[PDB]
Design a protein around this ligand. Structure first.
Ligand SMILES: CN[C@@H]1C[C@H]2O[C@@](C)([C@@H]1OC)n1c3ccccc3c3c4c(c5c6ccccc6n2c5c31)C(=O)N[C@@H]4O
Lengths: 264, 5
């Protein structure tokens, strides 16, 4: 069948110092896919990791192609856009919707950690939605392997986005990968339920962070969050990564298992 | 603009 390998780039999904992401439509089938275009003028690692990903809550990789200095990564398209845009500033979103998004986020993260991969930059802007509002973890440009041959490798590179980064990243030379992603997910949950980020960064020099450690939950954004989800947040946003709740236990949390959302 | 698969 001729022409089936032709794709028209009909829209720019995202840009920035790294290249661009275009929406591509198959000339024959009209199938939609996202194409990351990078001017070689990192990539090899991202591709390697993407080839390992196979899960309903993680953006799928279809393959790559290059023409000299330009690389083309074909990825699953998420027409729903960023979870970020579903968050109402200073408000958040309905608790049931946030719980559903959180459930899917955990599934994706559990999967990644299961194959020894850490995303390192979990935030609403990197969590995409498909046509059915199903969450998809995207952009593995900062991801890396933390477990190989069943042996865990401690991390030491500072990666991520300050508001979402765990405190140990700023205070310790080495740290475990998993608690870091757990922390990020907690910040994402906060955002979904309060429509605002708790602090610029998790450091003792940051007043907002000191207040949280001092348990002043009567201040925003904590006061806008119901007691059930707030209790979970008290277990996730724990400064000591060794004391921080793990995913297996998040799955046992009361709010996590609380009936709230009717099926579609 | 376009690309090949
Ligand atoms: C920070 N928000 C951006 C939004 C926009 O572009 C970015 C650059 C970022 O999304 C993670 N971006 C990537 C970066 C690196 C690898 C893959 C992607 C990607 C995909 C997609 C989208 C996307 C869909 C709808 C609206 C905005 C979008 N953005 C992206 C993607 C996509 O659908 N599949 C790719 O994983």
């Amino acid at each position: 069948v001729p022409f089936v390998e032709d794709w028209d780039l009909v829209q720019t999904l995202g840009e920035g110092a790294y290249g661009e992401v275009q929406l591509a439509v198959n000339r024959v089938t009209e199938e939609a896919v996202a194409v990351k275009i990078v001017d070689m003028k990192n990539i090899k690692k991202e591709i390697c990791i993407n080839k390992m990903l196979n899960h309903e809550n993680v953006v799928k990789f279809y393959g790559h192609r290059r023409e000299g200095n330009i690389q083309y990564l074909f990825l699953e398209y998420c027409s729903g856009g960023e979870l970020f845009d579903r968050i109402e500033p200073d408000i958040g979103m309905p608790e049931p919707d946030a719980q559903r998004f959180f459930h899917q986020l955990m599934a994706g993260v559990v999967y990644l950690h299961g194959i020894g991969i850490t995303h390192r930059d979990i935030k609403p802007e990197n969590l995409l939605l498909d046509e059915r509002d199903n969450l998809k973890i995207s952009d593995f440009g900062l991801a890396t392997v933390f477990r190989y041959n069943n042996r865990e490798r401690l991390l030491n590179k500072m990666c991520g986005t300050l508001p979402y980064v765990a405190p140990e990243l700023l205070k310790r030379r080495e740290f475990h990968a998993e608690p870091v992603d757990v922390w990020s997910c907690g910040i994402v949950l906060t955002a979904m339920l309060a429509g605002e980020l708790p602090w610029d960064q998790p450091s003792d020099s940051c007043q907002e962070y000191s207040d949280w450690k001092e348990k002043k939950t009567y201040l925003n954004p904590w006061k806008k969050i119901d007691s059930a989800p707030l209790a979970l947040l008290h277990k996730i946003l724990v400064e000591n990564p060794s004391a921080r709740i793990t995913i297996p236990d998040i799955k046992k949390d009361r709010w996590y298992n609380k009936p709230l959302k009717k099926g579609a | 603009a376009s690309v090949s698969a």
